[PDB]
Design an enzyme around this catalytic site. Structure first.
Site, mmCIF file in Angstrom:
data_model
loop_
_atom_site.group_PDB
_atom_site.id
_atom_site.type_symbol
_atom_site.label_atom_id
_atom_site.label_comp_id
_atom_site.label_asym_id
_atom_site.label_seq_id
_atom_site.Cartn_x
_atom_site.Cartn_y
_atom_site.Cartn_z
ATOM 1 C CB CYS A 1 -0.842 0.032 1.186
ATOM 2 S SG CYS A 1 -0.288 -0.306 2.661
ATOM 3 C CG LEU B 1 6.254 -6.965 4.401
ATOM 4 C CD1 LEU B 1 6.871 -7.868 3.330
ATOM 5 C CD2 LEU B 1 5.890 -7.485 5.869
ATOM 6 C CB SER B 2 8.010 0.027 4.804
ATOM 7 O OG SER B 2 8.323 1.307 5.148
ATOM 8 N N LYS B 3 7.809 -0.065 8.062
ATOM 9 C CA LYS B 3 7.506 0.315 9.432
ATOM 10 C C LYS B 3 7.207 1.670 9.135
ATOM 11 C CG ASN B 4 9.970 4.735 8.257
ATOM 12 O OD1 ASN B 4 10.140 4.719 9.331
ATOM 13 N ND2 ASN B 4 11.379 5.207 7.540
ATOM 14 C CB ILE C 1 0.576 -0.441 -7.755
ATOM 15 C CG1 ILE C 1 -1.044 -0.298 -8.273
ATOM 16 C CG2 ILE C 1 1.292 0.540 -8.696
ATOM 17 C CD1 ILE C 1 -1.692 1.104 -7.737
ATOM 18 C CB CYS D 1 15.013 0.879 -16.083
ATOM 19 S SG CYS D 1 15.299 -0.438 -14.910
#
Ligand SMILES: Cc1ccccc1S(N)(=O)=O
Length: 283
Positions: free
Chosen positions: A64, A86-89, A127, A260
């Protein structure tokens, strides 16, 4: 483990090449004259408009991010939202973004993977959710997504993709080996421990789980525009970016962004927005 941790980069660095929403995924330049920030909102709308969202439904956002997609869903479609990160921030920012919305709809952010998630939801969006979609286990992923949704369930997955070595060989061996080494760099230094799927994998794993899969949308020309702006913006903030990290990290991300853009232009990489429809999905 500790080797992968070498490639940890602070959120502050990403802010020096990304738009004000801090969206770390392909923008959607329709119309072509949209700013990057406008095109990032357009990409959220492109995904959400495919999901047949009705008021009072629950949307699951797998990966998210900073909560832009979930907020847009609540505002535009009057839906409940659940976010996985899975990111605390990102978890902290998402909680504040969702709490800020003037709504009585349910808003929840969970610090977990999809592997552990088993609540009924109406629709799913994901996404470029590297931490969720970048470690294979595709049979389990599509089975979970199929099973948590009702009869009319729909899901979008937007993902960077590579081609099977057999397909890459068709463009000649020189470019195939060169592209394969660039992909190894991406999943070593930029998305450590990653595995870049193919569009064919995304489609066939969905079908095996029971989903109807229409023709995937290629975002290739949009990612070229996104990467050009990201690269140009990082280069403009070189001194700032080096101060916050190092010349190493700056060179690494200029290599990623310029690289890329090159392989996208040469049609050796792609970005697929794949729609997954349950058998009872509205026509
Ligand atoms: C899914 C994946 C896998 C490897 C690298 C990057 C990605 S992304 N940016 O989530 O589409």
């Amino acid at each position: 483990e500790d080797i992968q941790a070498h490639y940890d980069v602070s959120d502050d660095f990403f802010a020096l090449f990304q738009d004000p929403t801090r969206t770390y995924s392909c923008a959607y330049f329709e119309p072509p004259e949209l700013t990057l920030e406008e095109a990032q909102y357009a990409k959220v709308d492109l995904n959400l408009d495919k999901l047949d969202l009705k008021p009072g439904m629950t949307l699951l956002d797998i990966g998210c991010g900073w909560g832009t997609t979930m907020r847009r869903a609540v505002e535009r479609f009057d839906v409940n939202v659940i976010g996985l990160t899975l990111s605390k921030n990102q978890h902290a920012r998402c909680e504040q973004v969702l709490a800020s919305i003037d709504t009585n709809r349910s808003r929840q952010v969970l610090l977990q993977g999809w592997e552990d998630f088993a609540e009924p939801v109406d629709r799913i969006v994901s996404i470029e959710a590297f931490e969720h979609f970048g470690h294979e286990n595709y049979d389990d992923f599509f089975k979970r997504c199929f099973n948590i949704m009702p009869a009319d369930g729909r899901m979008t997955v937007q993902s960077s993709v590579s081609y099977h070595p057999y397909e890459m060989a068709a463009r000649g061996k020189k470019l195939s080996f060169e592209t394969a080494r660039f992909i190894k760099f991406i999943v070593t230094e930029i998305f450590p421990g990653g595995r870049l799927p193919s569009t064919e994998m995304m489609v066939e794993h969905g079908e095996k789980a029971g989903f109807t899969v229409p023709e995937p949308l290629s975002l290739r020309p949009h990612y070229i525009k996104t990467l050009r702006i990201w690269g140009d913006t990082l280069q403009s903030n070189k001194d700032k970016a080096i101060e916050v990290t190092s010349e190493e990290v700056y060179n690494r991300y200029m290599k990623y962004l310029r690289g890329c853009e090159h392989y996208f232009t040469d049609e050796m990489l792609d970005c697929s927005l794949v729609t997954y429809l349950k058998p009872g999905a509205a026509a």
